[PDB]
Amino acid sequence: AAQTNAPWGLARISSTSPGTSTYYYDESAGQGSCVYVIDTGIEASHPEFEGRAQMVKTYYYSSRDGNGHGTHCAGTVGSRTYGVAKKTQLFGVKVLDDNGSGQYSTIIAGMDFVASDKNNRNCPKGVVASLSLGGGYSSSVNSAAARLQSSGVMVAVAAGNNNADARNYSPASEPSVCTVGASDRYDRRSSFSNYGSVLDIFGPGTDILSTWIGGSTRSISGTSMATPHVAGLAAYLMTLGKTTAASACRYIADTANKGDLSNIPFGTVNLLAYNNYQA
Ligand SMILES: [Ca+2]
Ligand SMILES: [Ca+2]
């Protein structure tokens, strides 16, 4: 299948070179997989989700996304127009308030929830979790991310946006999960992207068009936007039977575009998420 005039990021992940505008993907499109977006919520009623999205848990007064951030990330995972895995099932877990912040204790609770909840869902091709959030180092937070991964969920997390070594941020610094850096449409490391030996992979993160609240769309930038590209890719590959939750991050790294990125400091991987599609 081919989506013409696609968002640049979707084009980038199905191409060996920058500057193309068609997203090439197998028609299976993540069907039978499930992705938990742990964030500000998801506006499930947005037409772009086609009824494939639902809120399953909130830690605040309502389950609505009053912010936009969660809806944007979810769109990049699995909306029709803006998503990597266009037929996946999306589940929303609201651990961030409508200002986009949340206590570590709540974020941990949301991760433990997913490890359990997945056992009540029909996700025959596997389960992914996308975490476009983080803060200062906490061994508790890292440990929660490690538990979620260990339970058989592919965990993808943002490297963070401090233009610094991700070793000082959580859950970015947990080695066992898939830590995602950001690139721009010219194959530069995004100027804000964290780096360091703990990064596993890069994805598109500068000027990413996706869904927003009020049934709208907008472009924003962040390692928050790169993470769902990788989460979406994992769900897509699991559906095709190429990898499993336990080994998806390693498979994505092994099959990536290598050496394409500029402004990567010594000690940081030069690996860009790639779907290897051949028609
Ligand atoms: Ca290349
Ligand atoms: Ca890792």
Author numbering: 1 to 279
Give passages from the manuscript.
In this work, we report the first SSX experiments with viscous jets conducted at ALBA beamline BL13-XALOC. Small crystals (15–30 µm) of five soluble proteins (lysozyme, proteinase K, phycocyanin, insulin and α-spectrin-SH3 domain) were suspended in lipidic cubic phase (LCP) and delivered to the X-ray beam with a high-viscosity injector developed at Arizona State University. Complete data sets were collected from all proteins and their high-resolution structures determined. The high quality of the diffraction data collected from all five samples, and the lack of specific radiation damage in the structures obtained in this study, confirm that the current capabilities at the beamline enables atomic resolution determination of protein structures from microcrystals as small as 15 µm using viscous jets at room tem­per­ature.
